[PDB]
Amino acid sequence: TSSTAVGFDERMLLHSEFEVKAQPHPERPDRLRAIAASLATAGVFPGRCLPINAREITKQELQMVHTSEHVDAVDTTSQLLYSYFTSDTYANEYSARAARLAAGLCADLATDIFTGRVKNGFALVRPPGHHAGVRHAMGFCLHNNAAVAALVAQAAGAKKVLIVDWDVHHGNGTQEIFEQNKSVLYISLHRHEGGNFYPGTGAADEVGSNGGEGYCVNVPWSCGGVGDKDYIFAFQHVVLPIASAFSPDFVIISAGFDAARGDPLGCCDVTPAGYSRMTQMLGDLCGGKMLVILEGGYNLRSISASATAVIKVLLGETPSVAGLQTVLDVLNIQLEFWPSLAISYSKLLSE
Amino acid sequence: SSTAVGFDERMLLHSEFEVKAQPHPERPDRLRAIAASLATAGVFPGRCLPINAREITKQELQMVHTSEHVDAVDTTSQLLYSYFTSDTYANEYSARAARLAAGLCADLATDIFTGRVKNGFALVRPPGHHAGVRHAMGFCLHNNAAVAALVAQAAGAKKVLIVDWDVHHGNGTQEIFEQNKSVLYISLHRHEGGNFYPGTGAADEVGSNGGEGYCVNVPWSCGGVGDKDYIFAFQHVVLPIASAFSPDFVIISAGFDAARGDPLGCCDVTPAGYSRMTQMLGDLCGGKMLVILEGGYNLRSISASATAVIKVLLGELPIATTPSVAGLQTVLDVLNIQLEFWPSLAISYSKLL
Amino acid sequence: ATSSTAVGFDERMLLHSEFEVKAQPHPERPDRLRAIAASLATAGVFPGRCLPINAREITKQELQMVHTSEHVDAVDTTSQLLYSYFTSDTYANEYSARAARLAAGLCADLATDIFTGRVKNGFALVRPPGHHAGVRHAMGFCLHNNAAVAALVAQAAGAKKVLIVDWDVHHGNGTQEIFEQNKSVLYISLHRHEGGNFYPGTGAADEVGSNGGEGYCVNVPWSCGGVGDKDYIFAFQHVVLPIASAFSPDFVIISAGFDAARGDPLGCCDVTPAGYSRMTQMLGDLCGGKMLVILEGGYNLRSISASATAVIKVLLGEATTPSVAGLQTVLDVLNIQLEFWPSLAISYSKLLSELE
Amino acid sequence: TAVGFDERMLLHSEFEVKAQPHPERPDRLRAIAASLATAGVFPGRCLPINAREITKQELQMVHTSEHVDAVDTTSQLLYSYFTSDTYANEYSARAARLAAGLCADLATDIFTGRVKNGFALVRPPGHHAGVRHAMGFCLHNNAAVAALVAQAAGAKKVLIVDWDVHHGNGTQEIFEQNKSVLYISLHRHEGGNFYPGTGAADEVGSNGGEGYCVNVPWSCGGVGDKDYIFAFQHVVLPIASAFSPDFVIISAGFDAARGDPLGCCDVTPAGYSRMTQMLGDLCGGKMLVILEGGYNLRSISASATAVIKVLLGESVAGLQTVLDVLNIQLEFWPSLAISYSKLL
């Protein structure tokens, strides 16, 4: 009831690119191995954290998010030697089961957390999810785990779900899924560089559409490598004020760790202290009840320390000019939708 | 009365996407080169009827393949690229290309058998004869020849002949018809005791249960086989057994990779050899036959060989009369095995000069 | 013998071959050495205008200057299997480990004898090739990185600055990986690239090295196929030789693939023996003709025999306008490498002085 | 009754689909686990053991270090072949380590009385792997590893009964000189032309262990239930009774079954089940049964289930073969005259 659960299963290590290559793919089984070994050594998991049984998600639960076409396509890759949905998104014959285990782990953690069987949880899962849209696998992602968790939670009775995506890349897949949706609030912080950073989506004025306006909040950095001070600042002035006004029943963190110091893809500078602080800050919205789902993150040392710092928080254990400009531009846009941001607006204006 | 040619430019879209050190030999230029050479010869378009190209249906493919196999192939249209085996690729256009290739074969068989046209040539890719009941392999997605055979039977053909002169044994075709006697499968191919791809099709792989003797494998033991050995095997094995079978419908799996200059087959069949082989089979069903493209990887060789074959389908120095020692021994080994199922060969087999 | 050319060769390198029956033969095959050796014998070049050198298997200690212990153990273990695959295109049979070790051994001993002056220069007639093998992995038909081994062996024998020029039509992703952070080794590679749609996909013009290695990997990537002599000569005049002259190496290695040759089925380019001759002679300027030439790729038997004989004649002492695509490649490389080789400003001005 | 199983042994397979697909394939374990599931056990009546990877120290009681190192370096390759017909992929080394670890942990538990008996439902098979060679689809010799692990737990005398349709040339080679292990093999032999062409009738042990390898080489194909039970009551059980073993291992292949495409013999689940009951007389039904070959999916599911039930509760050409064995073996087994007399 007050415990932290970790969702993990070794069959997700079977998803990998087919052979060794001149340029090996950064999304690789060692990511989970390195985190799992560092949680073992710390006594965090196994140990202080509870395991949950790993279940393959059902097609019916996936179709709350994805078309039946996309689910069948992913499943059928199990009969091919290897395949690519896009140039950067691979599958082997074991990838469909891995993806069903990642989504099933997220689904069950989301149910367990929201209905109060456990306090909070970390889905230590592969492949990542937040670039998978309604009908397209891309950006290393096969099914959108975070969006599945949100809809499993809603189905269990959550009216308002918040997703915070601190992966260094914009969650184009998640935003597409909840574009016209206002029972889910999507907040993403990500490198953008005027749209030159992959995937080039998620400009600050991409606020949702057609009745969902205001419920997609993009905080897009104009450069790297952004450090802790800019994330905490954006959390104090954008994330927390909007999240508090929205008042969610359920909180999902899309925790990519590719914004960490040392990541070869993100080239940003967030420390474990930064991830720790952001986790604590989000805890005060739902009294420490939250589902943390692994997305990106590619330096084994960096993601091991950052994931350990985050799970320890689950257990209860002055910005740059670029950062100011991003927050300023976000509040200019979101003020029309979140009037309570005026208070934060006047505090920002005082530098 | 006329000759039909089945063709569609959308089969040109199937190609190997992944960057590989060695370029794949099964490539769109194969069809381009043949189409271009037929156009300048004035044969197609021009003298042949260009039938309408239709995608085959799953239900038609399933009288040969499993439902799982058909869904696997169809799903690759949703992937940038994929592999069924390490040498058998697909890109997002491959499923349509394979449906068109099988669909052209299906409709040519129907039109040829029912008399709408006299004969036809399926200018198609990917090839077909390596795909089995369950699996795509050896560059092949669906088995076009097997599909045309079963479509012909559904239209009333009671006895179908498939003669496969691709340099490789059609393991897929034999696996489909291994236990059938309503289809006679005759394959000539380099074999070298199993050391030539794909390693199947020894002289004694004859069929099973209902089907002993309805798979006839003519396996060469070496690799420079020329026209004289092919004509000799045709005179003494193929035509005698096919005539005893007496088919209602004739299919040629016409690979041209035993042709002089082919880099994979390294044999020495010339356009005169392919021409003469087509004429000989033409005397079985009054010139009515479906010729289906399988392999063949040298652009000049397949162009010259496909034109010669099609000119024979249109009504049009000798090949030597003595076979090589290796060719003669191959024919002896085949007759020794097949005489038990085709007693009519005792006539032939007193070839003992 | 100190003014002689040596040729390293051993018939046990011919036993490495593909055992599995495939529809398509593997282009990396024993006939490659056989054709070159027969052609050198016919031309009176070897034997015996050239000296042989005793073949010796490289040691694990020497290979570990470049490769991990586990990669060396992995390659060696293939000698206990009927056949094996490191990747789908990189095979082994029970003789491969010894063959790879002989190839590196010959390169190591040639590099030692050349740099210390026992012989003037040399040609390593070896297989399997090397420049796709990384610190950790065999791939691209290569088991160990022969050229990287020669470079570190020459460094252990006193060479401070080593130049590797790689004119194989493929980019040497493995050599670049090994020396990515190194500046005591300058790696220059010309290769077809086409924006990454050519194997192995690596080696864009802006991949210049990292950490203190910045500027010490120089990639000349062709945007198209069919590249001929005039583009290679043009890129040597304005990119290769200027940078190599500024670096000023104590030891020169040529990763000599001949798969850019006219007739090669894997490169589909058009370099002639005359182009390989001229590129060898130009590189002779840097070093009084003291260089080690190491066979990498090259798959058409007639083309590799002609080109290898022509190159070895130059070791023995024996069109000026680029394509449009060739000019563009050289311009993009100059624009990148100016940050690290400011003396390319001189070559830039000379280049502009000719049109069009 | 325990059952050793782990789904990571399903990862061992050939690299890609081929014209001639390999008969030793993960489906073999999938068919048995299914037929067991429907009649639950399994799972149900039988205990499940935790799967441990055998260690090198245990494997080296049986195999050379040369062999053990070759097998697990294949996890660093895309795919490999030890011989024409013995493949490995990236996962083969772990699968073979799990199969041996399962057999070893059953052998310790069954002998030390922690359970009456057990079935090791394992892939790849073992009985053709010798001291130095992976061959005949086999990477590590599971039966041999179980016998030596049993002895290390104080079992002084171990019997291995091998009714796979092929001779266990690997097992015999490991134990050719040992008399502490009794190896009895029933196999098709046809004068040395049935794979692997070893295991003639006159091929008893050597030299310290002559008479401790007992080969029953069938004349022909189509061997049926009658011949096998005939040889069990005139050869196996007599020689086994004189031996008096502490631990009994069955190398249970099922490629002598009705419909198998490699054996082409006619044994039925009746024969397998009664063969199992007969050996249960010794040691009171305390056996470790280890899956070897058997390639027709429904036959091996039938026969394996027949066998596991028993552990819970529940002629002319074959004639000469038996007397051929008795002529040879009675010199090393005097008690055989009692069974020889019955012929008659």
Ligand SMILES: [K+]
């Ligand atoms: K994000």
Ligand SMILES: [K+]
């Ligand atoms: K054929």
Ligand SMILES: [K+]
């Ligand atoms: K190069």
Ligand SMILES: [K+]
């Ligand atoms: K046996």
Ligand SMILES: [Zn+2]
């Ligand atoms: Zn990311």
Ligand SMILES: [Zn+2]
């Ligand atoms: Zn072919």
Ligand SMILES: [Zn+2]
């Ligand atoms: Zn090359």
Ligand SMILES: [Zn+2]
């Ligand atoms: Zn067996």
